[PDB]
Amino acid sequence: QGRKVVVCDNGTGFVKCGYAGSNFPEHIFPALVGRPIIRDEASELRSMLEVNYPMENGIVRNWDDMKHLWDYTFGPEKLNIDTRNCKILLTEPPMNPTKNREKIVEVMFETYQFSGVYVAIQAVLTLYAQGLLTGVVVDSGDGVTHICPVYEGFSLPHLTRRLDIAGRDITRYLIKLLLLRGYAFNHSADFETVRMIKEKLCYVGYNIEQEQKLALETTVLVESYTLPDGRIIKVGGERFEAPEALFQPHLINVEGVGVAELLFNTIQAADIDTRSEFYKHIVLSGGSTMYPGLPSRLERELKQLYLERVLKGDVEKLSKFKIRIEDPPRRKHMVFLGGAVLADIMKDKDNFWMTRQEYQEKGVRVLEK
Template identity: 40%
Template sequence: NGSGIMKAGLAGEERPSLVFPSYVGRPKYKKVLPGSMHEPEYYVGTEAEQNRGLLKIRHPLSHGIVENWTDMENIWRYIYNSLQTMPQDHPVLLTEAPLNPVHNRERAAEIFFETFNVPGIFFSAQAVLSLYASGATTGVVLDCGDGVTHAVPVYDGFALTHSITRIDLGGRDVTDHLMLLLRRAGYIFHTSAEFEVVRQIKEKNCYVATIYSSEDNYFDDPTKNASAYLLPDGRPINLGAEKYRASEILFSPDKVGLEYSGVQECLLNAIQKADIDLRKTLYSSIYLAGGTTMMPGFGERLLSDLRKMSPKEIKIKITAPPERKLTCWLGGSILSTLAAFKNMWIKKQEYEDEGKRILH
């Protein structure tokens, strides 16, 4: 249930059956030609992607928190229709970012139990599932997605809840900053559909600079090292320093006036909050997860910054699984097939008997 990308499928599958952007599009214009098919009130999934130029796009999730429950329900309904499954036949494993508001979980459970009539539900932190998919039981997961970055230390299968750190900074903020940098360069993007174009520019061209000042020297002449990107309408735009300056906000949010710590500090704080006897193990068992960590140079920059901030004798090892965009879903797919997991579902009858307090 990601802020940027939804992944859905049946337990036991090796890959999600559905992977699509987490947004709902509504038509901006009225149809003027008679005889055409009935126009849907909203579009989700591939249809929303294909028609985005005609749509006003809204993301129901912002920084891991649902802000529009009607659209969130529409996305979940689209998933059931696409999978051709009946909600009452299958319990649901739903992922969420750690340290989310209590209300978010309660409202989600209410919709699944009362609207979709599911037999059971289980909420799991994204990072824990990512570690599970990597085949490890000990480590610290840095999950950097579209809306949230969080670091979760896990030791022998136990999440160290007091050590979890979170910052509301992710890939969407990088896209926002890239849009601003392109505007300064003379390229104007302002509609919700054009925001998705900028996101694609980011995914295909942006990278993280290992040494920021060195990149500045490399791009001191804006025209010398620029690369061209072709927009959907055929117009080319030149990308220079924007390619690495956009992603720099992940490591130096203060450059754009944000009062967050960077992702490297988020990770370091999580390790430092753990018991002193566990820290050495956690330093050598860092796992990356989330689509934003796929950006070229992310792991190298993280390692470089951690070495500067950590004791010299500490061995730091970062594992970046190639499928880390999907490891959270894969972990959930594996976990929900285990026989022992059947006792962990919150059943509908239990929810009706005990109410919302059973969710916590």
């Protein structure tokens, strides 16, 4: 009846698009515009192709590339549908400029001439799949690890922090770490390779002292891995020390205190009537939330920063503090599914969605927000 609704998440590095209602994404392609100079369709050929990213750290840099990216996202490769005869729902990042949000709908009403549009907050959509009103949505993709606090369907822009450490930075940390270990890899040639190795064997440990101990003393953390060239490398403690920059951002020469310290200093910096509520509902969504062992470390450090500062040494008064974080099994793309749910729910619900006629008559900023 509504001419097929859809949902598209255009992230920094990985774009995930799926039909509304789908429990997963119906197409997941790498976000990179490629050009030739000689006489997942672009990622296959990158050694001899000039690749560019339209969405830099969440924001769009080159509209001439973003337009073609949209034409390739709605093209006969992944979606294969008419933009003028189908509605859509895009995902936006927290702390985004009003100019960006305006230009988005502007280009979605004029360039693509869509008949339907429905934007929503990624921090809100990520919790929407979990079915909650108040919670902490922390997104760590390839651009930046922004920590957003949501409450009653809204996010305090004065409470939304951000750590400049992303999956790309994890890759660079792993590739830098392996070099010291004795091996040798290139900064640009084996980029995706290093990213894969990190995605595979690397992780985040709970007890850094005990993990370092297990690595130095025992030979149980050391695992082997085969490369594309056929040669094999054996990485040990480098597996965990590389992702450990997520907890302490001083290991990569960055300004900040750490994701755990950021979340904790943003938790105690809330209303005292909401402090016991926001500490019991924290949603983990983003590519960097698939690192085996992040949940335990977050819970532990969050426990530390509310027992050294909130309890101030009081051991007995530590148990009373609620501590419950949920690492969902489908947390890898909660932003997408959360949309795929919303777009399925508000498919034909009243008329709370931007129209083309309302975008052609008047108001490119026709946004009830």
